[PDB]
């Protein structure tokens, strides 16, 4: 699809068999999801945004569907204002910015 | 152009007579630039994201050139870690996300 930017680019994702809403975010290096349970071990990470840095849990090789497109990759879990699909998964679903 | 998302989508902008580098950010409602002077009136605003909120000055009806495309809109000025071009100006240059 072609997504214009007059509204927030919110899509449905599926992770852990559950549907959630998330923002397609070209300004984000990484994908950051609200507190949830994921399988496996995690590693520590800090990520920085407009108001400062937050600690997150890094889970690798997580199966996630984004607007119907399958991806398998790193998901960070922590106190984000909105679920964010960042470039690590936007590249897996073949997203580009065009103008 | 078509911009892939393997790396951060950084472009050159011209704002207030100055050249700056900025990130094309579909996850941002607003355009936020590091400290600089701009003409006309302003009013204070708080804008948030990961890590919390920052205080900015809001200037309306500012002309910017984004990778050679002129647009007019609101620009927020304050201590952002990255210059970001948000949806309020991405729409005006006809930017879309495609996959």
């Amino acid at each position: 699809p072609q997504i214009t930017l007059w509204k927030r680019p919110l899509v449905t994702i599926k992770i852990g068999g559950q549907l959630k809403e998330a923002l397609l975010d070209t300004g984000a290096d990484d994908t950051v999801i609200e507190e949830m349970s994921l399988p496996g071990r995690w590693k520590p990470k800090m990520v920085g945004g407009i108001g400062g840095f937050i600690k997150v849990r890094q889970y690798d090789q997580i199966i996630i569907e984004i607007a119907g497109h399958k991806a398998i990759g790193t998901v960070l879990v922590g106190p984000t204002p909105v679920n964010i699909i960042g470039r690590n998964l936007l590249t897996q679903i073949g997203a580009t910015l065009n103008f | 152009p078509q911009i892939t998302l393997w790396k951060r989508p950084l472009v050159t902008i011209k704002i207030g007579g100055q050249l700056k580098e900025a990130l094309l950010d579909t996850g941002a409602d607003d355009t936020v630039i590091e400290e600089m002077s701009l003409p006309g009136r302003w009013k204070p605003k708080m804008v948030g994201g990961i890590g919390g909120f920052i205080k900015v000055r809001q200037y309306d009806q500012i002309i910017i050139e984004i990778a050679g495309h002129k647009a007019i809109g609101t620009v927020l000025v304050g201590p952002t870690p990255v210059n970001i071009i948000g949806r309020n100006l991405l729409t005006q240059i006809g930017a879309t996300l495609n996959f």
Partner: peptide
């Protein structure tokens, strides 16, 4: 890492 930058999330913005």
């Amino acid at each position: 890492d930058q999330i913005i």
